[PDB]
């Protein structure tokens, strides 16, 4: 009982595997899925247009609902809420993976990554990513802390300090972060502030999520097109809006 | 008599679909038909025809379809095996023709370089009431024949009666397009049916069991030919009434009767081809022999109206019709004791494969008052039944 709650929560936040909706009371007919797929794409488009994230979700009702256990038909509420988020994501992903170019998937990757950060920030537990980020973070040695002390204080001027500086990274693990102007480099090693631990979260998430689309496109390019008609005509519309 | 009705205990044997999960209620697909047919041809090949032949000559089994969309002729019958083998039949050179019936959708075995086999199955006190619709005179809505039918039924004290055929059809109520009565009241379809069935139960007083079988032309049942459960609403609460699917197979105390509710014999005979100079009774006998072999009477899929290609008399849902199939191997049991096939063929009552078939035609046939029906009496002590037909 508790274990399947934990697994469904992991699938809710990480959002990587799908479910079935035939037995779900609400989302059965072809009509409801149309608006369900339209709402998330609308939210994504406005998110990328404006660059308030929590103040966005309150507009489109996507918050996980709060309701006491004593409320009748309690299982309906969370099943409906769980169905919304899982079904919405894959339908939107399916559109880009088939029709958009690889130089155009980055817009979708950024939008989903950003809402991911909001979910973890307001979420009660980040243990899904907490364990893995321990594998990447490495505490700065006190020897190296004094070794580059003139260099560290050169880049860092404003405060908005031994513990303020955060655990450091190996160069080979994250080559993309050197081009950032906020990092300090000393003999193939990098020292970063603690608030960029959110930045590295998006870096890995984008790379893996962008990988699937090319694989998803590859699993489709070998065929001609979708075989069943009531979906193929539909998914095309979810590209321009 | 009364105790006999008290000990009726009627029950059916088919598995009835749950009214909320009909597999193919609206959606239809071509590919699934092809897969199902390709499975069933192999099933027949493995099970039935294999016992006759041991592996220049060639032997194969296949399905018969019309080469041209027009009505079939001896030169255009064609045999098909699978996605690849796709051939013709040319056995007309010698003009020889066996005692067999060929119709579209039939699965037959043929061998040649021609001999055809048709899946031959190896040879081997109570009274009932049978009535056929319609019950209202054409261009009239009085339903007075119902009154005299029940008059006869309650005069002869029959244990149980079977009512079958359209009650409110699209051939009588389309003209009225409404209901008006002498006492200045407006009625609807459901209220009319409730009035009719209240009349039935109050005239019979629930002393006898009643069996109702709906038909396609009924205006309330929108389903196709494998329709089911024409819902009955009645004020009387005693469970003297019953409803069943279109092709039914019900269980009397020890009697098992199979019902082909709509005009299968006439369509099968007229659509198919058969040798000439054969008497009409023998024609019907051979057509039913052919239909009994394929374990299902609704063998023909197109069943187009004769001389009218565009018009279709009955709508059959192909994927869902093979569920009601019943096999015949008399080595174990004789499964259908009585076959009821109401159709426009001449009245008859005969025995085939140690089972009896009856054809009580429609009462008030073709608008004339000269209706007719039939009764059956059987005695149990192995299987002796007395059958006689009554004309109005």
């Amino acid at each position: 009982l508790n274990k399947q709650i934990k697994e469904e929560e992991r699938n809710y936040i990480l959002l990587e595997n799908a479910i079935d909706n035939s037995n779900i009371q609400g989302f059965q007919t072809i009509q409801e899925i149309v608006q369900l797929a339209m709402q998330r794409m609308k939210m994504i488009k406005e998110i990328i247009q404006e660059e308030n994230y929590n103040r966005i979700r309150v507009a489109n009702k996507f918050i996980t609902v709060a309701i006491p256990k004593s409320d009748p038909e309690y299982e309906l509420k969370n099943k409906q809420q769980y169905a919304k988020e899982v079904l919405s994501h894959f339908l939107c992903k399916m559109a880009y993976a088939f029709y958009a170019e690889p130089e155009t998937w980055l817009e979708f990757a950024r939008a989903e990554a950003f809402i991911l950060m909001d979910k973890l920030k307001s979420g009660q537990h980040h243990a899904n990513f907490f364990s893995d980020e321990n594998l990447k973070i490495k505490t700065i040695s006190d020897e190296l802390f004094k070794q580059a002390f003139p260099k560290i204080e050169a880049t860092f001027s404003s405060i908005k300090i031994k513990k303020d500086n955060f655990k450091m990274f190996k160069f080979i693990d994250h080559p993309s972060m050197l081009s950032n102007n906020d990092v300090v480099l000393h003999k193939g090693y990098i020292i970063i502030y603690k608030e960029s631990t959110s930045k590295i979260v998006q870096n890995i998430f984008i790379e893996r999520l962008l990988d699937e689309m090319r694989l998803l496109q590859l699993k489709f390019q070998n065929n001609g097109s979708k075989l069943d008609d009531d979906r193929l005509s539909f998914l095309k519309d979810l590209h321009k809006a | 008599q009364h105790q006999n009705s008290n000990n009726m205990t009627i029950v059916d044997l088919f598995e009835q679909y749950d009214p909320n999960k009909i597999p193919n209620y609206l959606t239809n697909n071509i590919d699934k038909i092809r897969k199902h047919l390709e499975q069933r041809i192999l099933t027949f090949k493995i099970q039935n025809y294999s016992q006759f032949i041991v592996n220049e000559e060639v032997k194969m089994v296949g399905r018969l379809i019309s080469t041209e969309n027009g009505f079939l002729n001896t030169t255009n019958l064609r045999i098909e095996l699978n996605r690849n083998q796709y051939f013709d039949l040319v056995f007309e050179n010698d003009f020889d023709f066996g005692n067999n019936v060929l119709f579209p959708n039939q699965i037959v075995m043929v061998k040649g370089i021609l001999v055809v086999s048709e899946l031959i199955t190896d040879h081997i006190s109570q009274l009932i009431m049978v009535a056929a619709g319609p019950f209202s005179t054409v261009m009239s809505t009085q339903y007075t024949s119902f009154d005299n039918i029940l008059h006869v039924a309650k005069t002869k004290k029959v244990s149980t009666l079977i009512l079958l055929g359209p009650f409110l059809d699209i051939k009588n109520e389309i003209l009225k397009d409404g209901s008006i009565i002498i006492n200045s009241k407006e009625y609807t379809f459901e209220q009319l049916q409730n009035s009719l069935f209240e009349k039935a139960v109050k005239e019979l007083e629930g002393k006898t069991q009643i069996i109702i079988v709906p038909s396609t032309r009924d205006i309330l049942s929108t389903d196709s030919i494998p329709q089911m459960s024409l819902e009955i609403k009645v004020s009387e609460h005693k469970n003297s009434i019953h409803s069943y699917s279109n092709p039914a197979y019900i269980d009397i105390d020890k009697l098992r009767v199979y019902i082909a509710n709509s005009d299968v014999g006439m369509i099968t005979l007229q659509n198919s081809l058969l040798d000439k100079k054969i008497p009409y009774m023998q024609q019907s006998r051979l057509t039913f022999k052919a239909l009994m072999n394929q374990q299902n009477l609704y063998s023909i899929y197109p069943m187009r109206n004769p001389q009218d290609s565009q018009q279709i008399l009955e709508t059959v849902k192909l994927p869902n019709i093979n569920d009601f199939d019943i096999p015949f191997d008399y080595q174990l049991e004789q499964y259908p004791h009585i076959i009821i096939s109401p159709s426009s063929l001449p009245k008859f009552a005969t025995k085939i494969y140690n089972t009896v078939v009856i054809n009580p035609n429609y009462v008030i046939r073709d608008g004339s008052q000269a209706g007719n029906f039939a009764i059956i009496t059987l005695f149990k002590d192995h299987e002796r039944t007395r059958v006689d037909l009554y004309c109005l």
């Binding site: 003139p150 260099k151 050169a154 880049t155 001027s157 160069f171 080979i172 080559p175 993309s176 050197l178 081009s179 102007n181 300090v184 480099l185 000393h186 003999k187 193939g188 | -």
Partner: protein, 372 residues
């Protein structure tokens, strides 16, 4: 001229076993390192031979002597041997950096752009130490191998444990950091803030708070510039100064017409830009010095994870040069006029010269074989 080369191949390329050992990398413990390595040869009159993979050293030198390889190339290491079939994927390749004198053509004026002059080599002399300091301070990179090449500049081979198997994206990320001369001035990513890190060290101005200080930083570029060109072409730097307000450019152009001397012109420019604002002018000497001295890293040859390069000790009769080895500590002493050549024959001086070449090469060879 091919007969002399054919006779001389027995003497041209001594480091056969040394090259095999360098490519072998015995510390890794894997075998067939020489087997998988790409090689390409160039023959007389446009004939090109590629994927001339030799598993044995003996057949390697036999083919080397029998043919006429006017150019010898080094490639990467693949999955499996074989050529033009099975579309082999490459495993590993060493990191390379290329430097030439073409990017300094628009600055220098004392040479005819076809042959080098003694006044121009100082640019290479400063570029070598600049890039070496960058690599050593910013990365670990405990091994370096420069090579002088032909009639022009040098390359920068590297051998290290991890970077040999680095993917292409990491290669791009590394080469991005070492390029600062963005094509027209240094990019705003560093201009936007004070107390930067990279170009401050790249300008020989360490952490400091001053006449002796300014003199000891400026004298380098003074020696390199005020003798080769000594601001004979004002337009070259007036165009850059035009990036700022037209008033300052007008002031400096009006001022310069009187002095008509180079060092005094530079001092006048420094005085006229020292204290004319606090924010509008910023680092104005720094970007000028970087743009006028820093070398432009090539991004063509060192781009892909697989490529072909001119090997050490290659000889090409046009220009008569020998691509002698090099090392980081050799920067302060090297010259481009003492190199051996085919022309010397039966001469003790040239003998001592290539003996020194081999000993310098062996220095790094056993340095790597011991440090691994």
């Amino acid at each position: 001229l091919d007969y002399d080369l054919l006779e001389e191949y027995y003497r041209s390329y001594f480091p056969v076993s040394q090259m095999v050992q360098w490519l072998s990398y015995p510390q890794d413990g894997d075998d067939t390192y020489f087997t998988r390595r790409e090689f390409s040869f160039t023959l007389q009159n446009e004939v090109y031979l590629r994927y001339q993979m030799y598993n044995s050293e003996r057949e390697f030198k036999n083919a080397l002597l029998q043919k006429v390889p006017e150019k010898i190339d080094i490639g990467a290491v693949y999955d499996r041997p074989g050529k033009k079939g099975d579309d082999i994927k490459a495993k590993e390749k060493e990191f390379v950096i290329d430097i030439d004198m073409t990017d300094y053509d628009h600055i220098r004026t004392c040479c005819s752009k076809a042959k080098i002059c003694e006044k121009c080599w100082k640019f290479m002399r400063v570029a070598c130490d600049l890039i070496s300091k960058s690599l050593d301070e910013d990365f670990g990179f405990q091994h370096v191998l420069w090579v002088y090449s032909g009639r022009r500049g040098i390359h920068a081979w590297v051998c290290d444990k991890e970077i040999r198997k680095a993917n292409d994206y990491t290669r791009a990320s590394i080469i991005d950091y070492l390029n600062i001369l963005v094509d027209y001035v240094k990019p705003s990513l560093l201009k936007m803030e004070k107390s930067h890190l990279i170009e401050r060290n790249a300008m020989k101005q360490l952490n400091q708070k001053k006449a002796e200080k300014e003199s000891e930083k400026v004298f380098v570029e003074i020696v390199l510039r005020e003798q080769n060109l000594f601001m004979k072409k004002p337009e070259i730097i007036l165009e850059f100064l035009a990036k700022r307000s037209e008033n300052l450019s007008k002031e400096v152009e009006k001022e310069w017409k009187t002095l008509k001397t180079s060092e005094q012109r530079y001092e006048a420019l420094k005085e006229l830009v020292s204290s004319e604002d606090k924010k509008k002018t910023h680092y104005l000497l720094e970007e000028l010095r970087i743009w006028l001295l820093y070398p432009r890293l090539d991004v063509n040859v060192s781009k892909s994870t697989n490529h072909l390069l001119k090997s050490p000790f290659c000889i090409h009769p046009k220009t008569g040069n020998v691509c002698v080895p090099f090392t980081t500590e050799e920067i302060s002493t090297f010259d481009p006029f003492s190199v051996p050549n085919i022309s010397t024959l039966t001469t003790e001086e040239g003998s001592s010269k290539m003996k020194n070449s081999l000993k310098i090469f062996n220095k790094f060879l056993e340095n790597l074989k011991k440090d691994v």
